[PDB]
Amino acid sequence: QIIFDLGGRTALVTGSSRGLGRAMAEGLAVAGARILINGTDPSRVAQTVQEFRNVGHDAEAVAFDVTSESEIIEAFARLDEQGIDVDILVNNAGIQFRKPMIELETADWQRVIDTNLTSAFMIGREAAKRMIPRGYGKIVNIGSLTSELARATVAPYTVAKGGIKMLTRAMAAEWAQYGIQANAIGPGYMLTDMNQALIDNPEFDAWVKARTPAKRWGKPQELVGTAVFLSASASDYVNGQIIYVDGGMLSVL
Amino acid sequence: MSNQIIFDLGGRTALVTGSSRGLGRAMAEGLAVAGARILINGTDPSRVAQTVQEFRNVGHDAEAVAFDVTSESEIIEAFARLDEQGIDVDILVNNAGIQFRKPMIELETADWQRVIDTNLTSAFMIGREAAKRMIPRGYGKIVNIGSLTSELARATVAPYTVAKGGIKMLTRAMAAEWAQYGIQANAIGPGYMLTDMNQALIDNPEFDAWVKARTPAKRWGKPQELVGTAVFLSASASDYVNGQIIYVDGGMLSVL
Amino acid sequence: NQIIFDLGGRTALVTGSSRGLGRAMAEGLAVAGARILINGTDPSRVAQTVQEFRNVGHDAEAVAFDVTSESEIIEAFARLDEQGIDVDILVNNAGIQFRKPMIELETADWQRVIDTNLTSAFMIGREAAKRMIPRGYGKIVNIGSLTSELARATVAPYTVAKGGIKMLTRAMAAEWAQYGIQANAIGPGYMLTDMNQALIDNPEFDAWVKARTPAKRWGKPQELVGTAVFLSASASDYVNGQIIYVDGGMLSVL
Amino acid sequence: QIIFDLGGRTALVTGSSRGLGRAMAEGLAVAGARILINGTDPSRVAQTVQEFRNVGHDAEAVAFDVTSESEIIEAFARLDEQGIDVDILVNNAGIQFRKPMIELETADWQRVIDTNLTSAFMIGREAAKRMIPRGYGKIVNIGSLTSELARATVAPYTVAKGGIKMLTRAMAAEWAQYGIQANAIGPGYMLTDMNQALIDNPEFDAWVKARTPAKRWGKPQELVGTAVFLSASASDYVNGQIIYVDGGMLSVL
Ligand SMILES: [Cl-]
Ligand SMILES: [Cl-]
Ligand SMILES: [Cl-]
Ligand SMILES: [Cl-]
Ligand SMILES: [Mg+2]
Ligand SMILES: [Mg+2]
Ligand SMILES: [Mg+2]
């Protein structure tokens, strides 16, 4: 099915050296995309690139700090110079910080906003600058269940992801007319290392299973279909949507 | 060129209601191309036959399954025939529904009811019948067809708006009850699409200009542009997606 | 008083107000100053509620009719017209609950939920709106549910009907706001009423409500009153097509 | 009526020297609340306080830059010392900045985020710390139609207001159990000096009237009912909700 094929396209996935970003990058590569691996640690990025190459994927290392405008600008300039077009941007980079709001230092709030929200804006804007003259491109922002429903102790993350949902709509509002589709994925509770602490908590584990209609956690590879869909011609008239991949959790009391 | 398999529908049988023409036909053809066996359903049996034949000529496995989507007896009867034939309905696309344009202060209750019955009640009855076979098997996909009016109202199309809003909530209710048995119930909300059901809107320059101005993509959608979403929601690619409505509207719903 | 929340001089029809939440809201509107048209299916129950309202100083009239009967709805408004009684405020509160898994759900029970909740609100809203329009002002307050937004197993037809109510509210705004009519909705969460007695008397369900709600408690019937008055008053003249969830924060958190 | 009465309560409205904030503060005063007026121009704040006192309202100036954490903290310390409780907080302060994203400077993006979103978090956090031991409080964040629907050229405002909506829910998530209701108002197109460029653009004016079911702009005082509702006992069981006051605009195509 050509409509899901990504051959001839290049995807930059931020924070793809590990975790969900890597699982999505891997799935995009299987669908045919060349992959630009990104992460803060150059050595960790390089290791992930070699592993992608070892299984026959076309991959390049594009390490940069997603909170640094100058590094973002220089990374895209370097890509321009090598003749590498970024056709698909997945804004996956982001951190979590657990603390009740009355105990939350403004500096930590700010770090979560910068890493999750401002990063997506800066990187999205740089990608779009080049996609616009080409007349096509895909932007896939990674939100969260907290883009819509709040949870105690994760306020700055919740706010940043709520911002990401609206950033997605703002991107569609301005860029859809130029043939660019900006959409989002909202992962539910996934079996991934960032969640290991939650997964290890028997009470939290029980809550996830009782709160989710599917009665189970999601696996990281279960984000791949949605990521491929939103990166492929299959979603050419889809714009400004956030698709939750959460076993039904957001849909029910 | 990619050998990925998460979008393949081989071995699955899809029933698409109102698939003899329009968006339903386009989605049915898309499902067939992805590998699904197709059951075509429609009012005009002549239009149905022509559609089934056209599917067969291009190598699709297709068949007519006749029933009034508003008739419970006809629905239960149709599923009985499928049951005996060992046909599993693995994918149900609830696309059947009519439109009726009339301001509410002039709207006869009988026209209100017909819109509700054909759009909303049909989806409940047919979804209920499909699910009781899906549950024991432990897998299944239900794709309801909503509308932009599942979310935003428009003057003169109230009963449709109400029915499509119901469809969105019906989708969530289905996820609530069936997700645990391995069934994914999701929905598609087509925007303004180039179909004959909208020809009166397309051939009005004011409304045409409005669509292009109101939509960020600045264009109407083509029926084929629902295929990707329909296949995605019918395939293993969406196994952990439940209760979602995905709008295919060039961004119309996302902006002022 | 606070004049923007005053309903003096205005007349409110509240369907299903002979008892339960409908009665509590009708009483709230009366306290706010509205003359109340009490409605229910039983004329005797309706009249008794009317007399109780009047004995504590509220003005109230008996307007019994079956909300699923179009001919009775039309007949009732014809009576009101002839008396010169304007319906300035309509609260569509009537509607039944029916709990049953969808695979066990008879279509007739589904239909009764749809008719009593959704079709009734359309028919009555339509009759009210055509008299409000030439006056250039009016309020329609539909009663949704927190299930207008989020579903729950065993309550599909109610969820669907109330989801319909949310969109009906928006459809009413779309057509009638231009004429100075505001159509809005209330989505109650879990309320300590008699139609929820089973839920309330179930320790597992009671515990779930208290744990699932940020406010860690059920709502009281009186806690809908403020929203009903707000949406019935001058205070909400630029508010249209809104549904206000009164649910202790349930819909807003995981 | 008692359920809308604010007697015995004190409300802090940020950016209430003029515009929407001033209109809401006046309605809160009419409802019985003691009012704390805040704004950047000390003369305009003092003049507004005077006008409130002329009609018998209890009003007082409370000075702080809403983007300065130290000034916010000091302001609440002065309130504590004077025995002034903030029972009701209306986070109304904010700025607008119009510019397409590809041309938007990050510094401007950041100033809009800080002024609209971070401000509401810092001030809400400071207010909540006092409301919690009292077992009572109302927080009303001021969102926008852009909390829900995007518009080209106002992306950082859109994102900030989307953040406001989710912040409101995060507040409900952590604080509802302590008897604090956190909710939001999303004003539609209102006739304020801040909007005077749009109002005076005949194309934008005609668009508002055609796009709004009510076919008209809102007047600032039309926010009063919603503000009082969300500040009074009438909304004791309302938490985490945003109420749009937009003549129906968000509700229709
Ligand atoms: Cl996995
Ligand atoms: Cl097509
Ligand atoms: Cl009765
Ligand atoms: Cl004003
Ligand atoms: Mg098979
Ligand atoms: Mg009158
Ligand atoms: Mg006073």
CSV table of C-alpha atoms in Angstrom, one decimal, chain B residues 80-235:
chain,number,residue,atom,x,y,z
B,80,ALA,CA,-28.4,-14.6,10.8
B,81,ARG,CA,-27.6,-15.3,7.1
B,82,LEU,CA,-24.0,-14.3,7.6
B,83,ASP,CA,-23.8,-16.5,10.8
B,84,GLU,CA,-24.9,-19.6,8.9
B,85,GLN,CA,-22.5,-18.9,6.1
B,86,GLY,CA,-19.6,-18.8,8.5
B,87,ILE,CA,-18.9,-15.2,7.6
B,88,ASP,CA,-17.2,-13.2,10.4
B,89,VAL,CA,-17.8,-9.5,10.3
B,90,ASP,CA,-14.4,-8.4,11.6
B,91,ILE,CA,-14.8,-4.8,10.6
B,92,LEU,CA,-18.0,-2.8,10.7
B,93,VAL,CA,-18.1,0.6,9.1
B,94,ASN,CA,-21.3,2.4,10.1
B,95,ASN,CA,-21.6,4.9,7.2
B,96,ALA,CA,-25.3,4.7,6.5
B,97,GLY,CA,-27.3,7.9,7.2
B,98,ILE,CA,-29.3,10.6,5.4
B,99,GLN,CA,-29.3,14.4,5.5
B,100,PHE,CA,-32.3,16.7,5.8
B,101,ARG,CA,-31.9,20.5,5.6
B,102,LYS,CA,-34.6,22.5,7.5
B,103,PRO,CA,-34.5,25.1,10.2
B,104,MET,CA,-35.8,23.7,13.5
B,105,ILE,CA,-38.8,25.9,13.8
B,106,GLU,CA,-40.0,24.5,10.5
B,107,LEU,CA,-38.8,20.9,11.1
B,108,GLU,CA,-41.5,18.3,11.3
B,109,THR,CA,-40.8,15.8,14.1
B,110,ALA,CA,-41.1,12.9,11.6
B,111,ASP,CA,-38.2,14.2,9.6
B,112,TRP,CA,-36.3,14.7,12.8
B,113,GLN,CA,-36.9,11.1,13.7
B,114,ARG,CA,-35.9,9.7,10.3
B,115,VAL,CA,-32.6,11.5,10.5
B,116,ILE,CA,-32.0,10.1,14.1
B,117,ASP,CA,-33.1,6.6,13.1
B,118,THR,CA,-31.0,6.3,9.9
B,119,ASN,CA,-27.9,7.9,11.3
B,120,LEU,CA,-27.7,7.1,15.0
B,121,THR,CA,-30.1,4.2,15.9
B,122,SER,CA,-28.9,2.2,12.9
B,123,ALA,CA,-25.3,2.4,14.1
B,124,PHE,CA,-26.4,1.2,17.6
B,125,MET,CA,-28.4,-1.8,16.3
B,126,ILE,CA,-25.9,-2.9,13.7
B,127,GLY,CA,-23.0,-2.2,16.1
B,128,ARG,CA,-24.7,-4.3,18.8
B,129,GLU,CA,-25.2,-7.2,16.3
B,130,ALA,CA,-21.6,-7.1,15.1
B,131,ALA,CA,-20.2,-6.8,18.7
B,132,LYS,CA,-21.9,-9.9,20.1
B,133,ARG,CA,-20.1,-12.0,17.4
B,134,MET,CA,-16.9,-10.1,17.8
B,135,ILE,CA,-16.7,-10.5,21.6
B,136,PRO,CA,-16.4,-14.3,21.7
B,137,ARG,CA,-13.7,-14.2,19.0
B,138,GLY,CA,-11.7,-11.6,21.0
B,139,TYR,CA,-11.1,-9.1,18.3
B,140,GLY,CA,-13.0,-6.7,16.1
B,141,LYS,CA,-13.1,-3.1,14.7
B,142,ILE,CA,-16.0,-0.8,14.6
B,143,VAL,CA,-15.6,2.5,12.7
B,144,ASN,CA,-18.5,4.9,13.0
B,145,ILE,CA,-18.9,7.8,10.6
B,146,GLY,CA,-19.5,11.1,12.3
B,147,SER,CA,-19.2,14.5,10.8
B,148,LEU,CA,-17.7,18.0,11.6
B,149,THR,CA,-21.2,18.4,13.1
B,150,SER,CA,-20.3,15.7,15.7
B,151,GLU,CA,-18.5,18.8,17.3
B,152,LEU,CA,-19.8,22.0,15.7
B,153,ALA,CA,-23.4,22.9,14.8
B,154,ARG,CA,-24.6,24.4,11.6
B,155,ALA,CA,-27.9,26.2,11.1
B,156,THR,CA,-30.5,24.1,9.2
B,157,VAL,CA,-28.9,20.7,9.9
B,158,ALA,CA,-29.9,20.2,13.5
B,159,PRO,CA,-31.2,16.6,13.5
B,160,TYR,CA,-28.1,15.5,11.5
B,161,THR,CA,-25.9,17.5,14.0
B,162,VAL,CA,-27.6,15.8,16.9
B,163,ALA,CA,-27.4,12.4,15.4
B,164,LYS,CA,-23.7,12.8,14.6
B,165,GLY,CA,-23.0,14.1,18.1
B,166,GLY,CA,-24.7,11.0,19.3
B,167,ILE,CA,-22.4,8.9,17.0
B,168,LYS,CA,-19.4,10.4,18.6
B,169,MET,CA,-20.7,9.5,22.1
B,170,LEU,CA,-21.9,6.1,20.8
B,171,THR,CA,-18.3,5.4,19.8
B,172,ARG,CA,-17.1,6.2,23.3
B,173,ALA,CA,-19.8,4.1,24.8
B,174,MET,CA,-18.8,1.2,22.6
B,175,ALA,CA,-15.1,1.6,23.6
B,176,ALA,CA,-16.3,1.7,27.3
B,177,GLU,CA,-18.0,-1.7,27.0
B,178,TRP,CA,-16.1,-3.6,24.3
B,179,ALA,CA,-12.5,-2.5,24.5
B,180,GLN,CA,-11.8,-5.1,27.2
B,181,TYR,CA,-12.9,-7.9,24.8
B,182,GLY,CA,-10.3,-6.7,22.2
B,183,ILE,CA,-12.6,-4.6,20.1
B,184,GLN,CA,-11.6,-1.1,19.0
B,185,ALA,CA,-14.5,1.3,18.4
B,186,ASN,CA,-13.4,4.5,16.7
B,187,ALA,CA,-14.9,7.1,14.4
B,188,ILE,CA,-14.1,9.2,11.3
B,189,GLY,CA,-15.4,12.8,10.9
B,190,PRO,CA,-15.2,13.7,7.3
B,191,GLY,CA,-15.1,17.4,6.5
B,192,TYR,CA,-16.6,18.9,3.4
B,193,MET,CA,-16.0,16.4,0.7
B,194,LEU,CA,-16.5,16.3,-3.1
B,195,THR,CA,-19.5,13.9,-3.3
B,196,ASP,CA,-23.0,14.0,-4.8
B,197,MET,CA,-24.5,14.2,-1.3
B,198,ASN,CA,-22.9,17.7,-1.2
B,199,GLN,CA,-23.5,18.7,-4.9
B,200,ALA,CA,-26.1,21.4,-3.8
B,201,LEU,CA,-23.3,22.9,-1.6
B,202,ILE,CA,-20.5,22.5,-4.2
B,203,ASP,CA,-22.6,24.2,-6.9
B,204,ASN,CA,-23.2,27.2,-4.7
B,205,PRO,CA,-20.4,29.7,-5.1
B,206,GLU,CA,-21.0,31.3,-1.8
B,207,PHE,CA,-20.8,28.0,0.1
B,208,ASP,CA,-17.9,26.9,-2.1
B,209,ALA,CA,-16.0,30.1,-1.3
B,210,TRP,CA,-16.9,29.6,2.3
B,211,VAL,CA,-15.4,26.1,2.5
B,212,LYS,CA,-12.1,27.2,0.9
B,213,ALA,CA,-11.9,30.2,3.2
B,214,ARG,CA,-13.0,28.4,6.4
B,215,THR,CA,-10.6,25.4,5.9
B,216,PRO,CA,-6.9,26.0,6.6
B,217,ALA,CA,-6.0,23.7,3.7
B,218,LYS,CA,-8.2,26.0,1.6
B,219,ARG,CA,-9.8,23.1,-0.3
B,220,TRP,CA,-12.5,20.5,-0.2
B,221,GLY,CA,-11.5,16.9,0.6
B,222,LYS,CA,-11.7,14.1,-2.0
B,223,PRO,CA,-13.5,10.9,-1.0
B,224,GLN,CA,-10.3,8.8,-1.5
B,225,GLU,CA,-8.8,11.0,1.3
B,226,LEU,CA,-10.8,9.0,3.8
B,227,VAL,CA,-9.2,5.7,2.8
B,228,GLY,CA,-6.0,6.1,4.9
B,229,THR,CA,-8.0,6.8,8.1
B,230,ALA,CA,-10.5,4.0,7.4
B,231,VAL,CA,-7.7,1.4,6.8
B,232,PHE,CA,-5.7,2.7,9.8
B,233,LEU,CA,-8.8,2.3,12.1
B,234,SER,CA,-9.5,-1.2,10.6
B,235,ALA,CA,-6.0,-2.5,10.9
